[PDB]
Amino acid sequence: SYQKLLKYYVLNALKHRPPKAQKKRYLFRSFKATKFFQSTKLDWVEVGLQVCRQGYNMLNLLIHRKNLNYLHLDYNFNLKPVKTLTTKERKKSRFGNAFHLCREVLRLTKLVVDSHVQYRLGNVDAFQLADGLQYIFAHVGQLTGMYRYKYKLMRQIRMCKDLKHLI
Amino acid sequence: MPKVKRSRKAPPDGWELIEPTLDELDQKMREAETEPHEGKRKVESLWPIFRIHHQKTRYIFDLFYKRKAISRELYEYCIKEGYADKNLIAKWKKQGYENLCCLRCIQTRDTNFGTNCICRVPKSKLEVGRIIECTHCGCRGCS
Amino acid sequence: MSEEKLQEKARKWQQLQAKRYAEKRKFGFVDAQKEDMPPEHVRKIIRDHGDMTNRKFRHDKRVYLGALKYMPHAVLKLLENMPMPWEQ
Amino acid sequence: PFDDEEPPLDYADNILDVEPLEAIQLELDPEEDAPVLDWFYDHQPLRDSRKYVNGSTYQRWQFTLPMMSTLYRLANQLLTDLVDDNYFYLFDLKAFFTSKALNMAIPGGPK
Amino acid sequence: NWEDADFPILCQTCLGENPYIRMTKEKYGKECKICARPFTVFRWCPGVRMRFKKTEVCQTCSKLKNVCQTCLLDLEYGLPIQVRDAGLSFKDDMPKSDVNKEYYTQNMEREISNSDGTRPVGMLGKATSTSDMLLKLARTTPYYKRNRPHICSFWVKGECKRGEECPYRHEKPTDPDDPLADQNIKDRYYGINDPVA
Amino acid sequence: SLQAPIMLLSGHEGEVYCCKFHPNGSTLASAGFDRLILLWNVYGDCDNYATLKGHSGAVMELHYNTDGSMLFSASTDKTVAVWDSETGERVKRLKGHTSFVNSCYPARRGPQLVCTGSDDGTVKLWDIRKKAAIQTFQNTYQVLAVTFNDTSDQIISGGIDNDIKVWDLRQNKLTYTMRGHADSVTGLSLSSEGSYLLSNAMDNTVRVWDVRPFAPKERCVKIFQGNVHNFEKNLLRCSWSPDGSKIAAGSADRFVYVWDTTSRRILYKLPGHAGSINEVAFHPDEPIIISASSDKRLYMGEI
Amino acid sequence: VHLDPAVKEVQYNPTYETMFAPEFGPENPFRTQQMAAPRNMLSGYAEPAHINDFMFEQQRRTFATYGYALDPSLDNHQVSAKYIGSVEEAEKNQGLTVFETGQKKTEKRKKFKENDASNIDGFLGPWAKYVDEKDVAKPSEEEQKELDEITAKRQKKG
Amino acid sequence: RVALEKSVSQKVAAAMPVRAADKLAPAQYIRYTPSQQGVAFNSGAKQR
Ligand SMILES: [Zn+2]
Ligand SMILES: [Zn+2]
Ligand SMILES: [Zn+2]
Ligand SMILES: [Zn+2]
Ligand SMILES: [Zn+2]
Ligand SMILES: [Zn+2]
């Protein structure tokens, strides 16, 4: 693990082209210059619950707009068929790597946010919250399945194991 | 049951004489959050939030600039804890802007033609007696 | 003409030049800042817009789908500001 | 943590009124950790103090040597004891670049 | 194609009685009610108690048939299309079935874009020969009663909870036992069985 | 005609309230609503080089000295900044009005003097060396335009009372009143001889008035027409040609009128201006006209 | 008398005699009101104006409040000025705008006020309703029955 | 080259749709002569 982390450091240091000075772009400054955006201040757990609900709503609005009424996205971002599908329904409802990769990013964020929610409900602990987040960021390849829809994430996953052997 | 504080130091001196009403305003806000929309229009259901937010901020503003009943420390505690709005107060201290609804109703980025809402037009300069309800706010004539 | 009409013409030139050359109407006048909103506004908007199955909000059904293409970016900032186990 | 068919909990009633918990936040000595104890577990600790940072953009910090000493002996568990970089003679960045340029590996280094 | 034009084609009883008009321009806002290819939507308020009218059809569907983009009445005489085609000839014959309509639309728009962009493309030579009976029933004064908010459908059920703040009219809707109340958009456009006409 | 057919002078972000030709005529400096004054070399390729900032108002009036070495312009914030043509540095600022300075003129020949007029109803005489007003003439209505005679004895002021007023520097009294406008006077300018003063007004008529030791006593010497004012209520300024043969005055109908000095006949009426025109100026040697307008562009007409 | 009638954008500086002399000959009879007017695209002539924002919106709100305004035409019938609108109220109220202190000041409407923010469920700062005009507007005694009739006639169709 | 670079820029604007998302306030005026003059139609004027 130490040898692999050294290799990662050397590959970071070697292919370092200089920052290539661009024109600054400021996406969130152009959003709040429009009339469609407001700004407030909120607890992090509340915004995380909001982001999980919004991503859930986006994904099953994409499901319900494609008339795929025989699929179900549960609240932990598993996509399951409600019934047994025909050949035509199975050829119709096959999603690509974009939908599934975004679904698994939302699964990882809901794991993190639900860890904070069960902290803020008084259900778990503070130390068990820290250990739960450490397990989440050490075991994404075992808790999500992001690797199936983009395989290059193994570069990340092995690295987390190296850090788990480092610490 | 009350608002969870985020200071964790004890509140300042004159806290105990403004708390029944702050908690009563805070209980009033939790009513408006949970009202189901049925015969309330899409913009109309958010109007009580801006009214009660106006009321809480006006209450601390009256106790510090009019009645002089509160120190700087208790005043700035209520701003930090979210009982009063810092930006709404800073507009009420301006010259013409003294019964303002919202910060939406003077924001010129929020309108099509880059202007305030008709909320902010003096009722004598409408000269007709038309009835106004601002869509942002529900207001009938600040200015 | 008469003194009253000249006084009226002077008054309706003074008010005109006052409101037409105000300091908030100069060339590079950047107008005021958008300020913070009460935190209950977004809360009741998310509460009323539920699972988007209500008929009343059907016109927003299109807008939410477009916001899907920014849900990675909204993820990043969400996890960029995770609150630090010494924080409540 | 939550089951698959459980709808997500609303913040305004399940979480908004609950007192959160005790955080982790190690107990500091009031005499030995004196120039640090008042502010050490705040979010952006010395933010509204003009003597130690600028403003609320929170960009440039200016501490005193007791503060740097106290922050230094609070962080000994994550730091090293290497005073000079002569430790990294064949084990540093340019050495590993020379190793990658050739076919050589280092016995404790990358391949 | 798209349309993307500046300053719509309007008459004077739709553009309001104020010489000072604010309108917004939306680049590809809606689709045409006839052509179904999207165009630039212009939207203004006519007066004070009016309705916020907007343009309904393309620049092209008003170039082909010499009408206003929101009321679909003539620019010069101000009468329905079936009346003006009755007081003239009818040699346009725009197709109503789908693929023929879009094909004819593409080709006539190519003929428009292969010209100056100022004249009625086929209606000009037959617009020289004019001054029929249609000049003797053309409306002289503006009919500002079109620019008028709809009947409040909560007030018809006696449940208008806005009351005096409701901008919609609290007055009688027209009896549906009337030929004058069917009025399709496309029937008014193509000059087929318009009861006003 | 000298190297000028028409060109186009741009750079301005707001209406160009005033522009004057270099006393030499080789170079030019303009300013307006943009709170910027622009100098573009007239000859060669007509390109600006030096910009003079330092104004928290509308550089309403812009002027030049006989030499033209020192240029002084009047802003809308009640402060006048004096800038030399060379090196462009705010060199002598004089602040004495309580309201907007509408216009300023610099006395030629005699020891340096400057006159200003404002919405406070006063007219003030400034000596550039004193940092203080020398004389103050309270009118009662807003003053829009002011000019000195060539003898530096008299101040000529146009206001909103429709009556041009003449002030005596020694007596400090209302020496003369001129009747003949039906509405506010927006712009006054003396002939290079001292002989005649040109006026624009909201009464729809350009009037020449003759100022002399021996005057007819009813000095409506000539009247010209064509120049339109409207709801914009822009200050309108007019200019004399280098030889006094031509009269130019801007209008709100985007037309550069230029009448014949002796026959009062519209010599020119050029177009090419989108927005209302605020000032028209003549090159001191050649037949070149600079037209400045609210469309933020300049033209160099050549006759 | 020297230049083409309309091509556009003359490269030399013209004279008033060489551009604004009228066209000779009689008009052709083969043009209508739309075809004889110098129109730009099918409905008239549109050119970019550069009117001041304040003065524009002043006259606009003056018309929208009262019913009169100044004329924004370039020349029109040649003349320095005139008013366009309900002309009788212009000279009546001396031609004032909305942005100026009015002449008429009478008959102001009456509304509630409880500006203290201390009495919960009694505060209405700027949300105060009028005392005279009232909410939900039920129509009339016969308007209801005739609307029931017209909805019943709608029911006989579908 | 000036004529072709404009169409090049209009084609290239598709490639990155929103990096520094768009900004708009050139709110302008146009003077319009209605060309169907009536005594009462505009209200009382030749233009608008
Ligand atoms: Zn409001
Ligand atoms: Zn408002
Ligand atoms: Zn208001
Ligand atoms: Zn169309
Ligand atoms: Zn129409
Ligand atoms: Zn109603």
From Swiss-Prot, chain D:
Subcellular location: Nucleus; Nucleus speckle
Annotated transmembrane regions: none
Tissue distribution: Widely expressed.
Stretch forming the signal peptide: none
Superkingdom to which the source organism belongs: Eukaryota
Domain notes: The MPN (JAB/Mov34) domain mediates interaction with TSSC4 and SNRNP200. Has structural similarity with deubiquitinating enzymes, but lacks the residues that would bind the catalytic metal ion.
Subunit structure: Part of the U5 snRNP complex. Component of the U4/U6-U5 tri-snRNP complex composed of the U4, U6 and U5 snRNAs and at least PRPF3, PRPF4, PRPF6, PRPF8, PRPF31, SNRNP200, TXNL4A, SNRNP40, DDX23, CD2BP2, PPIH, SNU13, EFTUD2, SART1 and USP39. Component of the U5.U4atac/U6atac snRNP complexes in U12-dependent spliceosomes. Within the minor spliceosome, which acts on U12-type introns, interacts with PPIL2 and RBM48. Core component of U2-type precatalytic, catalytic and postcatalytic spliceosomal complexes. Found in a mRNA splicing-dependent exon junction complex (EJC) with SRRM1.
Record's protein name: Pre-mRNA-processing-splicing factor 8
The organism of origin for this protein: Homo sapiens (Human)
Organism classification: Eukaryota, Metazoa, Chordata, Craniata, Vertebrata
Whole sequence portion shown: 168 to 278 of 2335
Swiss-Prot record, chain E:
Entire-sequence positions represented here: 14 to 210 of 420
Subunit structure: Component of the pre-catalytic and catalytic spliceosome complexes. Component of the postcatalytic spliceosome P complex. Interacts with PDCD6; the interaction induces translocation of PDCD6 in the cytoplasm. Interacts with PPIL1.
Residues bearing the modification Phosphoserine: S89
Note on domains (UniProt): The C-terminal RRM domain and the zinc finger motif are necessary for RNA-binding.
Role summary: Required for pre-mRNA splicing as component of the activated spliceosome. Involved in the first step of pre-mRNA splicing. Binds directly to the internal stem-loop (ISL) domain of the U6 snRNA and to the pre-mRNA intron near the 5' splice site during the activation and catalytic phases of the spliceosome cycle. Involved in both translocations of the nuclear SLU7 to the cytoplasm and the cytosolic calcium-binding protein PDCD6 to the nucleus upon cellular stress responses.
Residues joined by cross-link Glycyl lysine isopeptide (Lys-Gly) (interchain with G-Cter in SUMO2): K126, K136
Name of the protein described by the UniProt record: Pre-mRNA-splicing factor RBM22
Zinc fingers, C3H1-type class: 146-173
Subcellular location(s) per record: Nucleus; Cytoplasm
Family membership noted in the UniProt record: Belongs to the SLT11 family.
Underlying gene: RBM22
Superkingdom in the source lineage: Eukaryota
UniProtKB/Swiss-Prot annotation, chain F:
Subcellular location: Nucleus
Mapped WD repeat ranges: 11-50, 54-93, 96-136, 138-177, 180-219, 230-269, 272-303
Cross-link Glycyl lysine isopeptide (Lys-Gly) (interchain with G-Cter in SUMO2) placement: K217
Gene Ontology terms: biological process: mRNA splicing, via spliceosome; RNA processing; RNA splicing; RNA splicing, via transesterification reactions
Disulfide bonds listed in the record: none
GO CC aspect terms: catalytic step 2 spliceosome; cytosol; nuclear speck; nucleoplasm; nucleus; sno(s)RNA-containing ribonucleoprotein complex; U2-type catalytic step 2 spliceosome; U4/U6 x U5 tri-snRNP complex
UniProt keyword annotations, A-Z: Isopeptide bond, Methylation, mRNA processing, mRNA splicing, Nucleus, Repeat, Spliceosome, Ubl conjugation, WD repeat
UniProt GO molecular function: RNA binding
Subunit-level organization: Component of the pre-catalytic and catalytic spliceosome complexes. Component of the postcatalytic spliceosome P complex. Part of the U5 snRNP complex. Interacts with PRPF8. Component of the U4/U6-U5 tri-snRNP complex composed of the U4, U6 and U5 snRNAs and at least PRPF3, PRPF4, PRPF6, PRPF8, PRPF31, SNRNP200, TXNL4A, WDR57, SNRNP40, DDX23, CD2BP2, PPIH, SNU13, EFTUD2, SART1 and USP39. Component of the minor spliceosome, which splices U12-type introns.
UniProt-recorded name of the protein: U5 small nuclear ribonucleoprotein 40 kDa protein
Annotated organism of origin: Homo sapiens (Human)
Parent-protein start and end of this portion: 54 to 356 of 357
Curated annotation (Swiss-Prot), chain G:
Coiled coil: none
Superkingdom as given in the UniProt entry: Eukaryota
Location in or out of the cell: Nucleus; Nucleus speckle
Documented effect of changing P26A: Loss of isomerization. Can rescue splicing defects when transfected in knockout cells
Disordered: annotated segments: 135-158
The record's account of how the chain is modified after translation: Undergoes isomerization of the peptide bond between Gly-25 and Pro-26. The reaction is catalyzed by PPIL1.
Protein's job: Required for pre-mRNA splicing as component of the activated spliceosome. Plays an important role in embryonic brain development; this function does not require proline isomerization.
Subunit architecture: Component of the pre-catalytic and catalytic spliceosome complexes. Component of the postcatalytic spliceosome P complex. Interacts with PPIL1; this interaction leads to CDC40 isomerization.
Connected disease: Pontocerebellar hypoplasia 15: A form of pontocerebellar hypoplasia, a disorder characterized by structural defects of the pons and cerebellum, evident upon brain imaging. PCH15 is a severe autosomal recessive form characterized by progressive microcephaly, and poor or absent psychomotor development with severely impaired intellectual development apparent from birth. Other features may include spastic quadriplegia, early-onset seizures, and chronic anemia and thrombocytopenia.
The protein, known as: Pre-mRNA-processing factor 17
Species this chain originates from: Homo sapiens
Gene name tied to this protein: CDC40
Residues of the full protein shown: 70 to 227 of 579
